Structure 1
Amino acid sequence: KTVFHLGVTEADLNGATLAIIPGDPARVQKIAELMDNPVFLASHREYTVYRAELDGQSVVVCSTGIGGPSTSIAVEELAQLGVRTFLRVGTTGAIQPHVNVGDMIVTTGSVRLDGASLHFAPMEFPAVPDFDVATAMKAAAQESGATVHMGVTASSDTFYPGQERYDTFTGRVVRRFQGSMKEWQDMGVLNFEMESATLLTMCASSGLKAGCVAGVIINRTQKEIPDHATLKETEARSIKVVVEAARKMLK
Structure 2
Amino acid sequence: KTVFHLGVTEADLNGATLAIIPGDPARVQKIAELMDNPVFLASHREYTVYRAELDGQSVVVCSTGIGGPSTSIAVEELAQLGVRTFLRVGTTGAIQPHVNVGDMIVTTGSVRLDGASLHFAPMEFPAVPDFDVATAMKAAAQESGATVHMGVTASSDTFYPGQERYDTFTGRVVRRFQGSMKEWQDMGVLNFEMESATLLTMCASSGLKAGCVAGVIINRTQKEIPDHATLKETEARSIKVVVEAARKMLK
Normalising by the residue count of structure 2, what TM-score does the alignment of the two structures yield? 0.99
Assess if the C-alpha contact under 8 Å between 1:128 and 1:200 holds in 2.
Answer: yes
Q: Spell out, residue by residue over 1:27-85, the C-alpha distance to the aligned partner (whole angstroms, 9 max, x if none).
A: 00000000010000000000000000001110000000000000000000000000000
Give the deviation of 1:224 after TM superposition.
Answer: 6.7
Structure 1 regions of 5+ residues with no counterpart?
none
Residue of structure 2 in register with 1:118 after alignment: 118
The aligned length equals 251
Q: Deviations over 1:101-145 (max 9, x none)?
A: 111000000000000000000000000000000000000000011
Residue 45 of structure 1 corresponds to: 45
SS of the residue 1:132 aligns to: helix
Structure 1 stretch 228-237 or stretch 57-66: which is displaced more? 228-237
Q: CA deviation at 1:230?
A: 1.2
The structure-2 alpha-carbon separation of the partners of 1:54 and 1:123, relative to structure 1 and needing over 3 Å to count, comes to same
Contact 1:103 1:216 in 2 (8 A): yes
C-alpha separation between the residues in 2 aligned to 1:101 and 1:126? 28
Give, in whole Å, the separation in 1 of the partners of 2:225 and 2:240.
24
Look up the SS of the partner of 2:101 in the other structure.
coil
Please state how far the C-alpha of 1:184 moved relative to its aligned partner: 0.3
Deviation of 1:226 after TM superposition, in Å, equals 4.0
**Does residue 55 in structure 1 map to residue 42 in structure 2?**
no
Q: What's the CA shift for 1:228? A: 2.0
Give the structure 2 partner of residue 193 of structure 1: 193
Cα distance, 1:188 vs. partner? 0.4
Q: Which runs of 5+ in 2 are unaligned?
A: none
Please list the CA deviations of residues 154-174 of structure 1 after superposition, one character each: whole Å capped at 9, or x if unmatched. 000001110011111111111
Is 1:127–1:201's contact at 8 Å kept on the other side of the alignment?
A: yes
Q: 1:141 and 2:156 equivalent?
A: no
Residues 12-91 of structure 1 aligned to structure 2 (within 5 Å): 12-91=12-91
Per-residue deviation, residues 4-31 of structure 1 (Å, max 9, x unmatched): 0000000000000000000000000000
Aligned residue for 2:82, secondary structure, equals coil
Would you say the 8 A contact 1:105–1:149 is kept in 2?
yes
Contact 1:19 1:61 in 2 (8 A): yes
Q: 1:103, 1:156 → 2: CA distance? A: 22
Per the alignment, do residues 50 and 5 of structure 1 end up closer, same or farther by CA in structure 2, a change over 3 Å counting? same
1:168-211 per-position Cα deviation (integer Å, ceiling 9, x unaligned): 11111111000101000000000000000000000000000000
What is the identity percentage for the equivalent residue pairs of Structure 1 and Structure 2?
A: 100
Structure 1's consecutive aligned runs of 4 or more residues displaced over 6 angstroms after TM superposition are: none
Could you tell me which residue of structure 2 aligns to residue 107 of structure 1?
107
8 Å CA contact 1:89, 1:214 repeated in 2: yes
DSSP 3-state at the match of 2:98: coil
Inter-partner Cα distance in structure 2 for 1:91 and 1:182: 22
Residues 91, 193 of structure 1: 8 Å contact kept? no
